[PDB]
């Protein structure tokens, strides 16, 4: 369905690896939904950025860091990010 | 809850007893009245926001039972009661006189 592809992409990644990949190979780095597949990432990117064609999706899960605060021991959310290669 | 924002009250208890003012803020049991119960704040300066800093003089919350609504006619401290107008309106009235206004 089309109401699932809107929630697949959670936000772009802004870091030096992201910027280097975008400059050199023109790949987009996204934070994606933790339950999203590579096929849904392909469809979401091509749907929401009209005029672009996805070549390859590489995905990974990254664990959240244990960051204490006051007397507590919490931890950040896990999250999944995708590297999306585009037809230039 | 009987004193709202905007009505004029008289301070009946504390260092500022006998002074009048307009109610700025009402919390559960504490009230803030402009011009009365003024503290000195040593505000630490900061560049992240637009406030300069310095020594400031701002009004502090005091207990709501230390203030009384000021009668607009007799110019004296008075209590507040409620009236059930047959037209279908619940208005605060003064306890002593009993007129609708405030």
């Amino acid at each position: 369905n089309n109401a699932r592809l809107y929630q697949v992409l959670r936000g772009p990644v802004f870091s030096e690896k992201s910027q280097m990949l975008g400059d050199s190979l023109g790949v987009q780095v996204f934070k994606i939904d933790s339950k999203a597949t590579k096929l849904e990432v392909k469809k979401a990117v091509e749907l929401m950025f009209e005029g672009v064609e996805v070549l390859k999706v590489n995905t990974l899960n990254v664990k959240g860091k244990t960051k204490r605060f006051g007397k507590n021991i919490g931890r950040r959310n896990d999250y999944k990010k995708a590297y999306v290669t585009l037809k230039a | 809850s009987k004193l709202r924002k905007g009505d004029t009250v008289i301070v009946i208890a504390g260092k500022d007893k006998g002074k009048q003012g307009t109610v700025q803020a009402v919390k559960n049991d504490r009230i803030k009245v402009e011009g009365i119960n003024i503290v000195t704040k040593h505000q630490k300066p900061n560049q992240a926001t637009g406030v300069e800093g310095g020594i400031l003089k701002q009004e502090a919350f005091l207990h709501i039972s230390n203030v009384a609504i000021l009668n607009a006619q007799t110019q004296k401290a008075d209590r507040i009661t409620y009236q059930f107008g047959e037209d279908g309106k619940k208005q605060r009235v003064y306890r002593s006189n009993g007129e609708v206004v405030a």
């Binding site: 089309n2 109401a3 809107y6 929630q7 992409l9 959670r10 936000g11 772009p12 802004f14 934070k31 929401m48 | -």
Partner: protein, 62 residues
């Protein structure tokens, strides 16, 4: 707000809900990239989507 939503057809409630989900994605991208000053549109848009889904459930149930 709900006043001008209760008298909308099921079809146009669906069509407006889809636009609201698209707007939610746009808000998410703008907030992640820093182009969202008033940071309450996300809350209001999410509440509107919840309202739309409530009304769609009601109109599909009765």
């Amino acid at each position: 707000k709900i006043s001008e939503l209760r008298d909308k057809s099921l079809e146009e409630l669906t069509q407006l809900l889809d636009e609201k989900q698209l707007d939610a994605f746009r808000i998410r991208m703008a907030k992640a990239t820093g182009q969202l000053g008033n940071t309450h549109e996300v809350r209001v848009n999410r509440r509107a989507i919840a309202q739309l889904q409530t009304l769609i459930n009601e109109k599909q149930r009765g």
